[PDB]
Amino acid sequence: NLPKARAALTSARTTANAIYCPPKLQATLDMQSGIIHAAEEKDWKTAYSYFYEAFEGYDSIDSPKAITSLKYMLLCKIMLNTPEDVQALVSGKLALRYAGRQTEALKCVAQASKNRSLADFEKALTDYRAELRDDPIISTHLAKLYDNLLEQNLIRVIEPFSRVQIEHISSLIKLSKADVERKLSQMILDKKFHGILDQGEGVLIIFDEPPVDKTYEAALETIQNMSKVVDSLYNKAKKLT
Template sequence: MSTSVQSPYLPATTESISKAQEAKDASESISILYRVLEDPSSSADALRVKELAITNLTNYLTKENRAEDLRNLLTQLRPFFAVIPKAKTAKIVRGIIDAVAKIPGTSELQISLCKEMVEWTRTEKRTFLRQRVEARLAALLLENQDYTEALTLLSGLIKEVRRLDDKLLLVDIDLLESKLHFSLRNLPKAKASLTAARTAANAIYVPPSQQGTIDLQSGILHAEEKDYKTAYSYFFEAFEAFNSLEDPKAIFSLKYMLLCKIMVNQADDVAGIISSKAGLKYLGPDVDAMKAVADAYSKRSLKYFETALRDYKSQLEEDPIVHRHLSSLYDTLLEQNLCRLIEPYSRVEIAHIAEMIELPIDHVEKKLSQMILDKKFAGTLDQGAGCLIIFEDTKTEEIFPATLETITNVGKVVDSLYMRSAKIMA
């Protein structure tokens, strides 16, 4: 059954399992468990012991980071799957795929493993299991940024599952579709898929972890629309759910909660959330990164802001959601600082502004030209002299807009009279 198998096989009994647990090292335990699986007996007791052996073997192989052996185990167990109920097969298959996912650097292996299992489930006509493995495969493709293949897979799967009305799986797939459309920057479709997931979830009992995922995605979409207050409440709900389950996703919910506080100009609240009982559990680089950003924003300091981005690059810039909102925040902060600095001047050297704001000259020049085009202030850049010339705000006489409005109204009356006279003449 495996290269690890020794001869002869061991009987599928609890004594054999105990022997494996008492072995001096993991390699010996793995060898014993492989031999237990070789037992040809298919009695109820033997099958139950083999299931326990598979669970233990999966745990040992995961701890030893033997991803390829886990993949081979799934292939080797196919004859065993023929003699146990389909629901148990599904549980074992999904358990082994989950185990491979715990081993770092196995995303390509997971994708090929899922594709293999999809082919096998098609051949064996195991629709229930195939749909779940395909959903897992779509999630892996999404993580791998293979959006086209993931979308093609989900489009077919969602129609099939809707027809079968499997609500729990439908929630998973709709959520995946929402994440996929969000990654493709298609916000209307992402919202539509999330609404579909919520509708399906309302009809059934949804596990807390899945409800947390729905809330997390809701928060992300609301934040994208700049509705940070609503986003905060969703992130808080997600954090509560993940925190109670000790799910690793809790740290992301907390991070996004802190981000929302900064974005609504309540950076001073960040320290309070971090020092709360729930917040203290997650102290680490992610929380430190958000605290550094909050401090920089409170001080309105671009220098501190850039230091935070540099010191916590993986926590801030490599998280696409945080990075997108912080880029917007940085632009706002930069514009506020520039407007404050140029206010006293009618003509000022760009180099002097760059020195005061502690940023490179070309960076400042580019931003000033963008602000002029966006009509954030009236002025022009004299690049020959390296100066910014600020125009005085020209006060518009109030009589001019009123005059224009009167002329427009007179024009409408004349047009109306012309139409009436034309009808009379006809």
């Protein structure tokens, strides 16, 4: 229940400064802000920073609580795939302080973030399935990943040659008409992909001529030129009568 969790988080906002010292609240409040907002899909890198700020407050607390705490933050590095904070965290003394079993399995999970590599990703997906169960939201984490990795693999095969047949290139992605080809059509709507397909002969042809410096810089000024005359129409009509 997300609205109930926000109401529970809202009650923690006024309770943080209510008593004298939290003693630890805002550290957990920022962690709770990195959960509900993570389900709200507000922002990734900032929510990942809340797991980093909470990890700084996790120093000298119950180890069974800190051994499952790295399950959330290191899998968050898997969701983002571009946190840019990788080298900062994992190279520090605080992230490497845990030598235990489960965290060593998370050490290669944090390495799997630097891995990507679909063929490797589909493999470690089964090896890390034990850590997949502790994922708070299993759908949102791996769906955006695999959907982002889709077009990451799509831009690789379409790049070398301009036009591509859609029957052979879809055999690598295992299907054509159901979803994939509709996802490539959505990339045209998002401008990430420039090209057009052919349903009859099954060939995707990429063609682009984006720049036009003659039409755009002209018509915009002519429309502005109308505003120059319309504003002068007040001078014209008033001086005559």
